[PDB]
């Protein structure tokens, strides 16, 4: 015990051509992700899937935010409106629109992402950091 009202449980990169799963278990030690990375082949299409649970009461204005950094320098910020969710037994899944990984030699390499899941009360449901490595091939 106990069970919070909102629990963010997973991040998944959904990519048909990836040879293996690309998932972060957000119920564990989030610090471990900083020394790990997901590899994506340059230019491939993918979505980001955020999995979460609502256990007791409605939460309005859920929002997913990603800040992308390159060698510690912020290069992009994207906010995604997730919406209002009530409680249920099954996990909820939020999928971002389809995006393409960067492509071309100058754009390959390592990127870090600072992710935040929040709501209209500005609740820090979860904050975590993870890495993407863009390569010529899988």
PDB file of C-alpha atoms in Angstrom, residues 76-136:
ATOM      1  CA  UNK A  76      12.879  21.161 -29.369  1.00  0.00           C
ATOM      2  CA  UNK A  77       9.818  21.121 -27.142  1.00  0.00           C
ATOM      3  CA  UNK A  78       6.535  19.406 -28.030  1.00  0.00           C
ATOM      4  CA  UNK A  79       3.360  19.411 -25.889  1.00  0.00           C
ATOM      5  CA  UNK A  80       0.671  16.773 -26.544  1.00  0.00           C
ATOM      6  CA  UNK A  81      -2.863  17.186 -25.105  1.00  0.00           C
ATOM      7  CA  UNK A  82      -3.881  13.781 -23.731  1.00  0.00           C
ATOM      8  CA  UNK A  83      -7.292  14.761 -22.271  1.00  0.00           C
ATOM      9  CA  UNK A  84      -9.606  14.020 -19.343  1.00  0.00           C
ATOM     10  CA  UNK A  85      -9.663  10.466 -17.943  1.00  0.00           C
ATOM     11  CA  UNK A  86     -11.680   8.687 -15.318  1.00  0.00           C
ATOM     12  CA  UNK A  87     -10.764   5.510 -13.456  1.00  0.00           C
ATOM     13  CA  UNK A  88     -10.951   2.047 -14.977  1.00  0.00           C
ATOM     14  CA  UNK A  89      -9.335  -1.367 -14.553  1.00  0.00           C
ATOM     15  CA  UNK A  90      -7.335  -1.426 -17.758  1.00  0.00           C
ATOM     16  CA  UNK A  91      -4.307   0.723 -18.586  1.00  0.00           C
ATOM     17  CA  UNK A  92      -4.865   3.750 -20.834  1.00  0.00           C
ATOM     18  CA  UNK A  93      -2.531   4.322 -23.815  1.00  0.00           C
ATOM     19  CA  UNK A  94      -1.814   7.677 -25.428  1.00  0.00           C
ATOM     20  CA  UNK A  95      -0.137   7.624 -28.850  1.00  0.00           C
ATOM     21  CA  UNK A  96       1.571  10.668 -30.394  1.00  0.00           C
ATOM     22  CA  UNK A  97       1.181  11.305 -34.111  1.00  0.00           C
ATOM     23  CA  UNK A  98       3.496   9.455 -36.486  1.00  0.00           C
ATOM     24  CA  UNK A  99       6.918  11.161 -36.721  1.00  0.00           C
ATOM     25  CA  UNK A 100      10.080  10.331 -38.681  1.00  0.00           C
ATOM     26  CA  UNK A 101      13.437   9.837 -36.958  1.00  0.00           C
ATOM     27  CA  UNK A 102      16.091  12.303 -38.159  1.00  0.00           C
ATOM     28  CA  UNK A 103      17.914  11.383 -41.356  1.00  0.00           C
ATOM     29  CA  UNK A 104      21.192  12.259 -43.011  1.00  0.00           C
ATOM     30  CA  UNK A 105      24.704  11.987 -41.629  1.00  0.00           C
ATOM     31  CA  UNK A 106      24.692  15.404 -39.892  1.00  0.00           C
ATOM     32  CA  UNK A 107      21.497  14.519 -38.007  1.00  0.00           C
ATOM     33  CA  UNK A 108      22.596  11.049 -36.829  1.00  0.00           C
ATOM     34  CA  UNK A 109      23.839  10.449 -33.305  1.00  0.00           C
ATOM     35  CA  UNK A 110      22.627  10.698 -29.724  1.00  0.00           C
ATOM     36  CA  UNK A 111      19.704  12.751 -28.406  1.00  0.00           C
ATOM     37  CA  UNK A 112      18.255  12.893 -24.900  1.00  0.00           C
ATOM     38  CA  UNK A 113      14.584  13.421 -24.078  1.00  0.00           C
ATOM     39  CA  UNK A 114      13.125  14.868 -20.841  1.00  0.00           C
ATOM     40  CA  UNK A 115       9.524  13.632 -20.547  1.00  0.00           C
ATOM     41  CA  UNK A 116       6.813  14.915 -18.220  1.00  0.00           C
ATOM     42  CA  UNK A 117       3.252  13.720 -17.725  1.00  0.00           C
ATOM     43  CA  UNK A 118       1.041  16.375 -16.081  1.00  0.00           C
ATOM     44  CA  UNK A 119      -2.494  17.793 -15.928  1.00  0.00           C
ATOM     45  CA  UNK A 120      -4.338  21.078 -15.636  1.00  0.00           C
ATOM     46  CA  UNK A 121      -3.446  21.186 -11.868  1.00  0.00           C
ATOM     47  CA  UNK A 122       0.264  20.962 -12.963  1.00  0.00           C
ATOM     48  CA  UNK A 123       0.630  17.686 -11.046  1.00  0.00           C
ATOM     49  CA  UNK A 124       3.986  15.958 -11.632  1.00  0.00           C
ATOM     50  CA  UNK A 125       2.480  12.552 -12.372  1.00  0.00           C
ATOM     51  CA  UNK A 126       5.898  11.430 -13.585  1.00  0.00           C
ATOM     52  CA  UNK A 127       9.061  12.975 -14.939  1.00  0.00           C
ATOM     53  CA  UNK A 128      11.808  10.935 -16.602  1.00  0.00           C
ATOM     54  CA  UNK A 129      14.791  11.182 -18.957  1.00  0.00           C
ATOM     55  CA  UNK A 130      15.720   8.737 -21.751  1.00  0.00           C
ATOM     56  CA  UNK A 131      17.896   8.568 -24.852  1.00  0.00           C
ATOM     57  CA  UNK A 132      17.570   7.993 -28.576  1.00  0.00           C
ATOM     58  CA  UNK A 133      20.501   7.072 -30.838  1.00  0.00           C
ATOM     59  CA  UNK A 134      19.938   7.594 -34.562  1.00  0.00           C
ATOM     60  CA  UNK A 135      22.019   5.262 -36.715  1.00  0.00           C
ATOM     61  CA  UNK A 136      22.498   4.487 -40.365  1.00  0.00           C
TER      62      UNK A 136
END
